[PDB]
Amino acid sequence: VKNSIIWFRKGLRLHDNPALLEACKDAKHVYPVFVLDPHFLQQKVSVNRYNFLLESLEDLQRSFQARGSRLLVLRGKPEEVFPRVFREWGVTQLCFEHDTEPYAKVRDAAVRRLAAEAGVEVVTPISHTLYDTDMLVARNGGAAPLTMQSFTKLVDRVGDPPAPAPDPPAAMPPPAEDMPSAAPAATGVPTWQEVGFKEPPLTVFKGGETEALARLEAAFQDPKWVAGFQKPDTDPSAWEKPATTVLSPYLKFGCLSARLFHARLLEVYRRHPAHSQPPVSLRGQLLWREFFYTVGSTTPNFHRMAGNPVCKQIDWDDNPEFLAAWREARTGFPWIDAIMTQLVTWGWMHHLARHSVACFLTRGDLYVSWERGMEVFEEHLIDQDHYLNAANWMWLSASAFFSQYFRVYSPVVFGKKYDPEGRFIRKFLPVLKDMPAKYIYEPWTAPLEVQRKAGCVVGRDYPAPIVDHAVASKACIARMAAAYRRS
Numbered sequence: 001v002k003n004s005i006i007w008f009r010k011g012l013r014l015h016d017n018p019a020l021l022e023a024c025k026d027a028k029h030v031y032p033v034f035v036l037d038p039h040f041l042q043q044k045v046s047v048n049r050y051n052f053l054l055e056s057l058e059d060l061q062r063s064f065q066a067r068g069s070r071l072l073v074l075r076g077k078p079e080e081v082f083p084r085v086f087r088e089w090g091v092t093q094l095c096f097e098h099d100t101e102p103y104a105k106v107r108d109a110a111v112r113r114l115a116a117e118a119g120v121e122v123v124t125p126i127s128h129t130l131y132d133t134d135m136l137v138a139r140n141g142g143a144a145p146l147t148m149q150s151f152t153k154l155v156d157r158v159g160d161p162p163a164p165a166p167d168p169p170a171a172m173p174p175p176a177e178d179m180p181s182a183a184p185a186a187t188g189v190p191t192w193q194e195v196g197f198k199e200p201p202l203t204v205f206k207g208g209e210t211e212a213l214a215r216l217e218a219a220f221q222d223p224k225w226v227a228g229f230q231k232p233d234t235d236p237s238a239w240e241k242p243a244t245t246v247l248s249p250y251l252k253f254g255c256l257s258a259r260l261f262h263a264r265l266l267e268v269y270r271r272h273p274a275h276s277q278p279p280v281s282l283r284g285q286l287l288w289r290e291f292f293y294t295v296g297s298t299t300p301n302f303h304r305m306a307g308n309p310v311c312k313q314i315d316w317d318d319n320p321e322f323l324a325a326w327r328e329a330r331t332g333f334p335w336i337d338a339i340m341t342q343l344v345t346w347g348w349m350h351h352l353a354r355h356s357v358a359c360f361l362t363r364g365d366l367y368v369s370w371e372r373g374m375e376v377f378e379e380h381l382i383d384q385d386h387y388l389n390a391a392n393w394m395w396l397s398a399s400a401f402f403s404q405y406f407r408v409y410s411p412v413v414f415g416k417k418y419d420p421e422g423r424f425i426r427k428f429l430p431v432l433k434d435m436p437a438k439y440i441y442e443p444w445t446a447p448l449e450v451q452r453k454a455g456c457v458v459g460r461d462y463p464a465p466i467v468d469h470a471v472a473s474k475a476c477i478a479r480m481a482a483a484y485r486r487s
C-alpha cells in the first residue's frame with residue numbers, strides 16, 4: 001500500500017499545496033508532520049515570531065481535524081526522526097515544498113539520502129515562489145538578473161506563474177492507529193510557555209492560513225485600491241489601518257500562497273486597465289520578493305558582506321554604543337525610537353519605516369554595519385525572511401542594488417510630512433503623549449517650561465539625541481563617497 005508523509009517546513013497551508021495533493025493521491029495513510037527542535041531557544045528568536053509559527057500550526061491542526069486527520073509535531077532533528085518513522089509507519093513516499101535557503105539545502109539533501117536507503121520516493125514541488133527560480137536563471141542565459149528592470153522583462157518573456165493548485169479533498173487518509181511515534185501526547189502543538197519563553201507576545205497579527213486568507217479578502221474588498229496601489233506613496237505612520245497589506249508574515253511562513261495572491265491580482269487587473277505597473281504595483285511587490293529570492297539563492301554568502309560578490313566592501317564602524325542605543329530605541333529621535341519600539345512590540349513595520357531606521361543605523365548617521373542591524377531585525381520581525389532581510393539591508397546601506405548615497409532620510413522631517421501631530425509617535429512612545437506637536441519630532445528644542453508641563457524632560461524622561469544629524473549625515477556621506485571611489 002501507499003503510506004505518505006507530507007513534511008511541513010514552510011508552506012503552512014492547505015490551499016495551493018502540490019506536495020500535500022501528491023501525498024494524498026492513492027494514499028492509504030497520510031502523516032502530516034512538522035519537525036520541532038525542542039532546544040532551539042537553548043542556542044535569537046523573539047516570542048512574537050515563534051508564537052506566530054505555533055498559531056500557524058494550531059490552524060493547520062484544526063484544518064486536518066475537520067478533514068478526519070491530525071497534525072503530528074515531532075520533536076527532534078529531521079536527520080534523527082525520519083529514519084525511525086520511515087520504518088515504523090511503512091512510508092513509501094515523502095513530500096515537501098522545495099526550499100532554497102542555505103540551511104535547507106544541507107538539511108534536505110541529508111533527508112533525500114536517508115529516504116533513498118529506506119526506499120522512500122521523494123517529491124519536492126515548487127510552490128513557495130511564483131516561478132521555478134532555477135528556470136528563470138536558465139532562461140536568462142545561466143545567470144540571475146541583477147536589476148529589477150531586466151528581471152521584470154524576463155518574467156514577461158516567461159509568462160504567467162503556474163496557477164494555484166486545487167484544494168485538497170474534503171476527507172484525508174488519517175495516520176495509522178496505535179503507532180508509537182504518533183502518540184498524541186508526544187505530537188501535540190506546544191504553547192509559547194512550554195517551549196521556553198517567559199514573557200508573552202505583544203504582536204497584533206495572528207498566525208495561520210485562515211488569518212492569511214481573511215487578510216487577503218480584506219485587501220481585495222476595494223478593487224480600486226488594489227489596482228491603483230503605488231508602494232512609494234503609502235503612509236509609514238499608519239498603524240490603526242496599515243497602509244499596505246501586511247501579508248508579509250503569511251507569505252514568509254507560507255500561510256498564504258504567492259501564486260494565489262498573484263492570480264487574484266490578475267483578476268482585478270483585467271477589469272481595471274489603468275492599474276499600476278511594476279515595480280510600484282502590488283504585483284510588483286511580489287516581483288521584488290521573487291527578484292531577491294532569485295538573486296540570493298544563486299549568490300554565495302548572500303547574507304554576509306565578506307565573500308559576497310554583489311555586496312560592496314565598506315569598512316563600517318564597530319560602535320557597540322551606537323548599536324545599543326539604536327537597538328534599545330533610545331536614540332533620542334522620537335521617529336526612530338517609535339519605529340524600533342513597533343519592531344519589538346508588533347514585529348512588523350511599514351516598508352518606509354524600515355527605510356528610516358535602516359538608513360539611520362548604516363549609511364545615514366551611525367555608520368554601523370548592516371549585518372548588525374540585520375541581526376536585530378532577524379530577532380524581532382515576524383516576517384523575517386533570509387533573502388528579503390538581506391537584500392533590503394544591502395539596499396538601504398548602499399552596499400548592493402542601491403547606490404544613491406546622497407539620498408539621506410532625515411530622522412526629523414521624514415515622518416512629519418505624513419503625520420505632523422505625531423500620532424504614530426504618541427502611540428508607541430507614550431512618554432511623549434503630552435508633548436505639543438511643534439516639538440514632538442524635536443523634543444530637545446522645546447523650552448524647559450513646556451517639557452515640565454508635558455512631563456517629559458529631555459535627559460530625564462526621554463534621552464537627548466545621540467548625534468547631531470547635520471554633522472553625522474555629512475560625515476557619512478563623505479565616507480560613503482570615498483568608499484565608492486576606492487573600488
Ligand SMILES: Cc1cc2nc3c(=O)[nH]c(=O)nc-3n(C[C@H](O)[C@H](O)[C@H](O)COP(=O)(O)OP(=O)(O)OC[C@H]3O[C@@H](n4cnc5c(N)ncnc54)[C@H](O)[C@@H]3O)c2cc1C
Pocket residue numbers: 231244245246247248249251252285286288289292349350351352354355358377381383384385386388389390392393396
Ligand atoms: C531593512 C529592511 C528589511 C526588510 N526585511 C524584510 C523581511 O525580512 N521580510 C520581508 O518580508 N520583507 C522585508 N522587507 C520588505 C518590506 O519592508 C516588507 O516586505 C513590507 O513592508 C511588508 O509589508 P506588506 O506585506 O504590507 O507589503 P506589501 O507592500 O503589501 O507587499 C506585498 C508583499 O510583497 C513583498 N515585498 C514588499 N516589499 C518588498 C521588498 N522591498 N523586498 C522584497 N519583497 C517585498 C512581501 O512578500 C510582501 O508581503 C524589508 C525592508 C527593509 C527596508
Ligand SMILES: [Cl-]
Pocket residue numbers: 408409410413414
Ligand atoms: Cl527626508
